[PDB]
Amino acid sequence: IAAHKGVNQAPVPLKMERVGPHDVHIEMTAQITDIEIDKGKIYKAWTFNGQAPGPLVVVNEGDTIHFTLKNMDPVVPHSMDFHAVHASPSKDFIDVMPNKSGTFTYPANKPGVFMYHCGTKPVLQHIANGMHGVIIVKPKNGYPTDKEVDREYVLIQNEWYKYNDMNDFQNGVPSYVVFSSKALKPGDPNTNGDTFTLKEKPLLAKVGEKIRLYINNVGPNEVSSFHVVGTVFDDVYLDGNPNNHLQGMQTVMLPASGGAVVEFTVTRPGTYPIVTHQFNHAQKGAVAMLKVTET
């Protein structure tokens, strides 16, 4: 895109604030940002806030979101679709023009680990170019296993294709499949979907801990066979809804846009790979590491 040549918009922090017991303001950008998706490979991503996947959003069950999108893209319209919410797509997930802002309000009444993404046609193009993310809605009554959890992280799986190539997006295999982590607490890593960062800078944990991962596979196109090497999931909640409770899974199948909360124990010191078990995708980037130490 001629108006994107040379564009590299610095990442802008997510802006959130609570404005009532059940009401939260969120402000995001749509912006054009170079991201190194594999060593030596820059993708001029279409993004929320200069991250791909975008920044993590966390709300409480029952919160109404008053969402603003500020479109920094000089030429392409963008929009926002939160899978968490009940909304009229043709009124509430509509386009914001270049250099404009739009505000939309809708309720998050369901707990879970939801995808968000740009909803502008062609949606495949906007997703594939980077405009995806996760919103977590915390359940009012928690999860039954909350008390057993020692540590938690968020992981997101995505694919990358040939740059802005719709033929490839629709017909081709992914060039890369990747994990990213988005921070829940200070100190947590916050990374973009790339083939290497979570190998070089593993997630951390201690021996004996029960680890919770909030996970979502945002696609655009593939399903995920999510697995932690050297463990078994003690408990899984599909889509992060507490009622959708499975036990003792080795591998959790996630549809495109599918989420889960998974929990597992790391019993020994060492480094534990985290994969999609579709190993063509793992080979093409989708392996993260978890480094478990006596500390």
Q: What residues numbered 30-89 form the site for Cu ion, per CB under 5 A? A: 66, 78, 83
For Cu ion, which is the closer residue by CB, 20 or 40? 20
For Cu ion, which is the closer residue by CB, 36 or 278? 278
Which residue in this structure is represented by tokens 């993590």?
56
Indicate the annotated binding residues for Cu cation.
Answer: 78, 83, 117-118, 126, 131, 277
CA distance 13 to 150: 28
Of positions 6, 21, 39, 171, contacts a second copy by CB under 8 A: 171
Q: Does 115 bind a second copy (CB under 8 A)?
A: yes
What does the block give as tokens for 250?
Answer: 């080795």
In angstroms, what is the minimal distance from the CB of 194 to Cu ion?
19
Of positions 44, 195, 241, 261, contacts a second copy by CB under 8 A: 241
DSSP β-bridge partners for residue 180: 156
Question: Could you say which of a second copy, Cu ion, none residue 87 binds, taking C-beta under 5 to 8 angstroms by partner kind?
Answer: a second copy
Q: Are 120 and 153 in contact (CB under 8 A)?
A: no
Of positions 34, 61, 150, 152, contacts Cu ion by CB under 5 A: 150
Indicate the annotated binding residues.
Answer: 4, 22-23, 25, 36, 38, 61, 66, 78, 81, 83, 86, 117-118, 126, 131, 150, 152, 165, 209, 222, 227, 231-232, 234, 245, 253, 277, 281
For a second copy, which is the closer residue by CB, 190 or 250? 250
CA distance 81 to 269: 41
Sign of CA dihedral 271, 277, 280, 285: negative
For Cu ion, the binding residues in 117-146 under the rule CB under 5 A are: 118, 120, 126, 131
Of positions 44, 257, 263, 286, contacts a second copy by CB under 8 A: 257
Buried b (16+ CB within 10 A) or exposed e, 198-237: beeebbbbeeebbbbbbbbbbbbebbbbbbbeebebbbbb
CA distance 247 to 59: 26
For Cu ion, which is the closer residue by CB, 194 or 234? 234
CA distance 159 to 276: 12
In angstroms, what is the minimal distance from the CB of 153 to Cu ion?
15
Q: How many CB atoms lie within 10 A of CB 91?
A: 9
Question: Could you say which of a second copy, Cu ion, none residue 147 binds, taking C-beta under 5 to 8 angstroms by partner kind?
Answer: none
